[PDB]
Write a protein that binds this DNA or RNA. Structure first.
Ligand SMILES: [Zn+2]
Length: 635
RNA sequence: GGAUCGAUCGAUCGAUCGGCAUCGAUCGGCGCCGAUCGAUGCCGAUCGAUCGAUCGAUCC
């Protein structure tokens, strides 16, 4: 039922000016959006009809919004549909838009439509609502819609432009340190989303706080381990692994430039990735030993990264969790290859494993962070026996690992399997949520706590300046609400005109396609896969090979999660077909009826025929060559 | 497969402050010392811009 708080938040969009409204709940935002839909469609007289469009970023919020919009719009004679990825092909989108009003499409569909040529203008819609509207920052699908609207408006061909109301729970601060910078960022958001009103609660603050989460920050800066025997053993393992890895390259230190590469840190992982991408462009002209040293090194660097991830886990989660992580990696990599390099590294791991299992089983080497995490979990489960603890870690490799520690520690018995009837849920990004714990990271039942366990004070100072930024954002929101309307309209017109001018400034022209027929090699294996003359791009994004000689150069493996993206259908994952390479290459797909595997340039390297230089690319847009479109008449 | 966002970290550049090292100008005392100003190199603290890596999430 609509209360005075929702009507006070929904007041400035009744007049007909765009808003960036802020409600801290989700159901209140949904009710306000439904109220704006009701008042906006009911204001039209006979002979005209409105086309209020709702945008939802993710699939579950799209399904929730589609269910709510279908449930409420039953007694008003209003039709409701929503389009998504599994709905995109089905029937053509122009017939859905032209024969309905309340489209709840996800924004990437509209971005693809306005890029294609369908939906010739944004003036068909009469109101536009943006769920989670502070995402309109840079190159977002919401921002692509807003760039289209600003090019339609400021170009001089503006017609019946839609109202551009928003929906969020936080305006955001960004890279702002002073109050003028926060005001500049909020004005930049208001100009990019093209609004002159920021609606927030100013009078009915008493009934607002009945659903507000209101966290209680309880930071605990607690020191790390002292007796690092496992770190000593595996650090010696990286030391002699890197020393034996220098028997094939005499300039491994000259490949990278990131110094202070201490083990167990993200800086070491960055050094490992940089030295892997530095070795991956190897051009020794023997072309038979080159595959051998590239395969050997790649095994060395994947072992090094696996060891570094083992100490990152052992720093955060248990010692034994690092041991099972390394044992699982060696068990999965033993079946992939049986050469001298793999056997040598595996027999080195079993020659260290006899002391590794002795060190890991020692109960005097437990992590102190896990000890006081168990202590605080014990005391909050003792205070209340129905606490749902959310646990935020940095990586998914910890997500099961801490869970195994939850399945390993005998002092706790009220913790239950909840890896994401579940007592504790451990995840990485986002319900009751009575307790939140952030383990080295940076709902209902009000009175919640948000513990933060870090071995560094930088995260504590970041959360302190985050609280200062929240207070300063609320102060800048009140300051912008105190301003006059016409000066704010002139300000957002100036800011969005400067934004449109600097957007048209960064319009790079078409790059030229390189005329040579370049050859693609494996990342880890350096085998002849295909030439670029046989590389056809299908829908200006996806690339494939129609070569008959390419068909025997790969092998198949069953896909764990097939899912029909766009008009394609996944069937299997393709891999390199050799003795001990087994490198990922792409994915087996069906377009309409053919089975032509689509590759990714991420797991490939590009070599030219004349110069012979090997180039490393991560996205297909960075690759500039003769992009011949895929013709179905050939194969 | 392709795109998008967020957190941490790295590289480069610029700005503010402090410290070390070096070269010149003025004043005072008995060639030496104290003070300030001007310039260069390095490091530390903070901020901004660009690029990248990892991790996570999202969409098509
Ligand atoms: Zn291969």
């Amino acid at each position: 039922k609509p209360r005075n708080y929702q009507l006070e938040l929904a007041l400035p969009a009744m007049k007909g000016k765009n808003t960036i409204i802020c409600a801290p709940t989700g159901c209140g935002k949904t009710f306000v959006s439904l109220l704006i839909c009701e008042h906006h469609l009911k204001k039209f007289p006979q002979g005209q009809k409105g086309k209020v469009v709702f945008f939802a970023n993710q699939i579950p919020v799209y399904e929730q919004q589609k269910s709510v919009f279908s449930k409420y719009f039953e007694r008003h004679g209003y039709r409701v549909t929503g389009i998504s990825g599994a709905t995109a092909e089905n029937v053509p989108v122009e017939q859905i838009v032209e024969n309905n009003d309340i489209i709840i499409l996800t924004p990437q569909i509209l971005v693809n439509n306005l890029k294609k040529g369908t939906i010739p203008s944004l003036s068909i819609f009469t109101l536009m609502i943006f769920d989670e509207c502070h995402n309109t920052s840079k190159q977002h699908p919401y921002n692509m819609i807003m760039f289209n609207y600003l090019d339609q408006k400021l170009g001089g061909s503006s017609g019946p432009l839609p109202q551009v109301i928003g929906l969020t729970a936080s305006v955001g601060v960004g890279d702002a340190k002073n109050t003028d910078e926060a005001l500049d960022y909020i004005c930049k958001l208001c100009a990019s989303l093209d609004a002159s009103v920021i609606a927030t609660v100013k009078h009915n603050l008493e009934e607002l706080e009945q659903v507000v989460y209101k966290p209680q920050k309880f930071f605990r800066k607690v020191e790390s381990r002292i007796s690092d025997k496992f770190k000593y053993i595996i650090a010696q393992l990286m030391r002699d692994t890197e020393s034996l890895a220098k028997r094939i390259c005499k300039d491994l230190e000259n490949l990278s430039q990131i110094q202070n590469r201490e083990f167990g840190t993200q800086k070491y992982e960055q050094w490992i990735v940089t030295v892997q991408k530095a070795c991956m462009v190897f051009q020794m002209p023997d072309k038979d030993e080159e595959s051998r040293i590239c395969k050997a090194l790649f095994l060395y660097t994947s072992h090094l990264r696996k060891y570094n991830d083992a100490l990152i886990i052992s720093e955060h989660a248990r010692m034994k969790d690092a041991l099972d992580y390394l044992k699982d990696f060696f068990s999965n990599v033993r079946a992939a290859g049986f050469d001298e390099i793999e056997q040598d590294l595996t027999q080195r791991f079993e020659e260290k494993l006899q002391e590794l299992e002795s060190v890991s089983r020692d109960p005097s080497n437990e992590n102190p962070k896990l000890e006081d995490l168990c202590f605080i979990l014990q005391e909050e489960y003792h205070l209340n026996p129905e606490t749902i603890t959310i646990l935020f870690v940095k990586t998914r490799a910890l997500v099961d690992a801490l869970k195994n520690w939850i399945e390993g520690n005998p002092k706790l018995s009220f913790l239950k399997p909840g890896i994401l009837d579940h007592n504790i849920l451990i995840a990485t990004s986002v319900a009751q949520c009575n307790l939140v714990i952030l383990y080295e990271y940076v709902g209902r039942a009000r009175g919640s706590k948000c513990f933060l366990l870090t071995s560094n004070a930088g995260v504590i100072e970041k959360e302190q300046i985050n609280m200062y930024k929240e207070k300063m954002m609320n102060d800048s929101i009140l300051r912008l609400q105190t301003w006059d309307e016409a000066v704010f309209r002139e300000k957002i017109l100036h800011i969005q005109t400067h934004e449109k001018f600097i957007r048209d400034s960064q319009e790079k022209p078409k790059p030229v396609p390189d005329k040579e027929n370049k050859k693609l090699l494996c990342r880890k294996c350096k085998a002849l896969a295909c030439y670029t003359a046989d590389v056809r791009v299908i829908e200006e994004c996806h690339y494939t090979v129609l070569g008959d000689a390419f068909k025997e150069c790969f092998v198949s493996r069953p896909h764990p999660k097939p899912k029909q993206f766009s008009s394609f259908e996944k069937r299997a994952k393709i891999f390199c077909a050799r003795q001990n390479c087994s490198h990922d290459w792409g994915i087996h797909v069906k377009y309409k009826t053919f089975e032509i595997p689509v590759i990714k340039i991420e797991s490939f390297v590009v070599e030219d025929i004349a110069t012979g230089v090997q180039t490393l690319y991560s996205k297909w847009k960075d690759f500039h060559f003769e992009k011949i479109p895929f013709d179905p008449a050939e194969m």
